[PDB]
Amino acid sequence: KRDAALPSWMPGADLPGYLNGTLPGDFGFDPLYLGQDPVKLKWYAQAELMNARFAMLAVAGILVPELLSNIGFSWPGAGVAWYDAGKFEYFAPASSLFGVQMLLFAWVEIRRYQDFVKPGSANQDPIFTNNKLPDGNEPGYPGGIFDPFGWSKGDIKSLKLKEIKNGRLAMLAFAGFIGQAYTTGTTPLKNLSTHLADPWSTTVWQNDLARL
């Protein structure tokens, strides 16, 4: 039932009709029919954006710090694996940092949720009432102060597709960090160097068979 002009995750396949192509990154992939219900699909679309944008920040926050250390840049946190950052000594105890984090994230997340329930109802600054986001925004794409450079005024449809594509790739990358670190016990870029050193004897088959 899906339009044949739309791109497909499996060329030639007959895909569900409810994925009509409005959402970005709509390739008709839903073999388990999780998004069949329109009410749940609405929630999943936002959840995909949220997990996708945190994954992109997280992946960039795990490679660049490791890349800089390998280059030679020196700073107190250099050379610390992403899975050992918790034990590192910061200016404040980790417990107090977590407490501040939840209070700050309670404010912004409840503001974001208010918009999802009633879009356009959280666009106004509560203190400096003059400030406000433009009235045309949609859930998940605030704009206004969140888009200071005005990129959203261009080809928005292409930009949203680029965002979700990079986001889906970042989500897989973070899942790779968990699996690779758990099985190899080393940082992701060290794993890449091992693979490039001898690609033909460093596959997951080679590595896991040895550990078997």
Give SS3 for 70: helix
Question: DSSP alpha helices (H): ranges in the chain?
Answer: 38-71, 94-117, 156-184, 188-197, 204-211
Q: Does 131 bind other proteins (CB under 8 A)?
A: no
Rounded least distance, CB 88 to ligand CLA, Å: 4
Q: How many residues touch other proteins (CB under 8 A)? A: 17
Give SS3 for 55: helix
Give SS3 for 138: strand
**Which amino acid, one-letter code, is at 176?**
G
Among residue numbers 1 through 40, which ones bind other proteins (CB under 8 A)?
A: 39
Q: What is the DSSP letter of 141?
A: B
Contacted entry of ligand CHL, other proteins, ligand CLA, none for residue 93, CB cut-off 5 to 8 Å set by kind: other proteins
Q: Does 172 bind ligand CHL (CB under 6 A)?
A: no
Q: What's the chain's length in residues?
A: 212
d(CA 206, CA 194): 12
Q: Does 2 bind ligand CLA (CB under 6 A)?
A: no
Q: Does 94 bind ligand CHL (CB under 6 A)?
A: yes
Rounded least distance, CB 149 to ligand CLA, Å: 18
Rounded least distance, CB 25 to ligand CLA, Å: 5
Binding region for other proteins (CB under 8 A): 39, 91-96, 98-100, 114-115, 118, 121-122, 124, 126
